[PDB]
Design a protein around this ligand. Structure first.
Ligand SMILES: Nc1nc2c(ncn2[C@@H]2O[C@H](COP(=O)(O)OP(=O)(O)NP(=O)(O)O)[C@@H](O)[C@H]2O)c(=O)[nH]1
Ligand SMILES: [Mg+2]
Length: 163
């Protein structure tokens, strides 16, 4: 029974926590930022193959353990936060250095696309960035009813399996 350690990274406020709690617990709780580090563990079936998903919602010995051991990374920015998108490169570079690899399983996640009037990063900008890194691109909303939240996590597992 394979365990996949997934790591969610990105700037403050982009929705790492909201995405994770939506995926594991199927709720959206506005302006909830966890008091303590919460680990996430669940059995789920992806393309008929069962897996344990072990997720870190990112000093911390825990963080750096997951950065080192992680099987795949979600790199999240918010479409309403241009800086968060500009900072994606820091996260991409950080991950490749820690894994000492030229590529590693990862998905670029453009979150908060429900806030349409506030969108500062276009679909095509996002897609062009993902292309530059040769990684998948997906748009999400953690807000109910959620968009692409299961697909995002399941797709990362698919990337890991198909490497
Ligand atoms: N409308 C909308 N709000 C969202 C979405 N995702 C997160 N939010 C909201 O944005 C705020 C910040 O989200 P949060 O999940 O805590 O972000 P974070 O990346 O975990 N922040 P941190 O790095 O500081 O832990 C919260 O108020 C949350 O409800 C989304 O898809 N749509
Ligand atoms: Mg958080």
């Amino acid at each position: 029974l394979p365990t996949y350690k997934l790591v969610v990274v990105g700037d403050g406020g982009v929705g790492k926590s909201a995405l994770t709690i939506q995926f594991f617990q199927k709720i959206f709780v506005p302006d909830y930022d966890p008091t303590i580090e919460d680990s996430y563990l669940k059995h789920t079936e992806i393309d008929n193959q069962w897996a344990i998903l072990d997720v870190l919602d990112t000093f911390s010995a825990m963080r750096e353990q997951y950065m080192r051991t992680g099987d795949g990374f979600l790199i999240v920015y918010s479409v309403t936060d241009k800086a968060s998108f500009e900072h994606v490169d820091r996260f991409h570079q950080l991950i490749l250095r820690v894994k000492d690899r030229e590529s590693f399983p990862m998905i670029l996640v453009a979150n908060k696309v429900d806030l349409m009037h506030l969108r500062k990063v276009t679909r095509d900008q996002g897609k062009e960035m993902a292309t530059k890194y040769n990684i998948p691109y997906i748009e999400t909303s953690a807000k109910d009813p959620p968009l692409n939240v299961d697909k995002t996590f399941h797709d990362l597992v698919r990337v890991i399996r198909q490497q």
